[PDB]
Amino acid sequence: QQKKTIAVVNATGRQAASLIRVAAAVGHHVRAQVHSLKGLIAEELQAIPNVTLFQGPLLNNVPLMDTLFEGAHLAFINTTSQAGDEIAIGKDLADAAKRAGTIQHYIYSSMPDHSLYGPWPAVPMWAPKFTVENYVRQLGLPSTFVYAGIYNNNFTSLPYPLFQMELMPDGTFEWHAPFDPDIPLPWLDAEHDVGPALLQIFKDGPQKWNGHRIALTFETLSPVQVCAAFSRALNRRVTYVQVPKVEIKVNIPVGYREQLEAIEVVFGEHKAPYFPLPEFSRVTDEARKLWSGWRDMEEYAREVFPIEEEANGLDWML
């Protein structure tokens, strides 16, 4: 009923920003930690009225966490490895949240630890989250865990890793990834659907979701099918090409490399599920039930891809 105050970290992150825009819009007050104030997203969030920002790093910084949860009734927590040890940060955040005592619903965005389901290795930017999930549960915080699917918007023709929908000379598009071309993977339109869904979860309350794990994915497509979607949306021919490794065409930070190499082994060699957890092994049922207005890959493909490209610096759409 009443609109409560929500604590969010990594405000410029796609999941958080999506939640923040819709939350502030409907009347919720937001308190969010951002690494930097400079930036398009950053600047935008600053502009939104009831959005109070706290600039500073999360790592070994309990004073910031305490402030963040002051007067906070809800919380959506999604940390990024870039900020440092996600386990130590995720645990400090949970501690502060309980220490605040006003949190009635703590939504932690989690990810699987693949080594717990097969001879597979632990994807370094995923596994750590599963540990924090356990720690949240351990404190007794009324919580809910959401597992995000692969973002539709990771796609770009630009030379960025793993999800480059490259523009070939002959005006065609080709996407090179380790993923099996036929194995359906869970996708999610972060900017379009994370916010609405999170709101619905908060509106539902812990009375329904407490302790639950929810797969935040609204559609499952294979690398080939995703390619099909782009093709019948841009009028051009798009083809998928399974490559043993991730083509790093630019200078990426060390931590992000380790991540990809792991992705290569899990999805490239072993062809393991994105969500290897038994409860997730349709997985999209809960999400669609929480939010019926999701954006599939085709709409993303036709309505957003062209637009993001142009703004990014490309004119193949003209």
């Binding site: 825009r21 819709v22 409907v26 619905q200 019926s292 207005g293």
Partner: protein
């Protein structure tokens, strides 16, 4: 057609604004559930 809000032309179902304006599924459903127009980025 075209959503009056997000301007998308691709949507699984068209809905309407209390005034008569066409909104896509998401925007229409969002306004109905939360009371305000679906905010967009940028």
């Amino acid at each position: 057609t075209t959503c009056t809000n997000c301007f998308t032309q691709t949507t699984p179902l068209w809905r309407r604004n209390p005034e008569g304006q066409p909104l896509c599924n998401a925007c229409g459903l969002f306004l109905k559930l939360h009371g305000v127009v679906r905010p967009l980025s940028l």
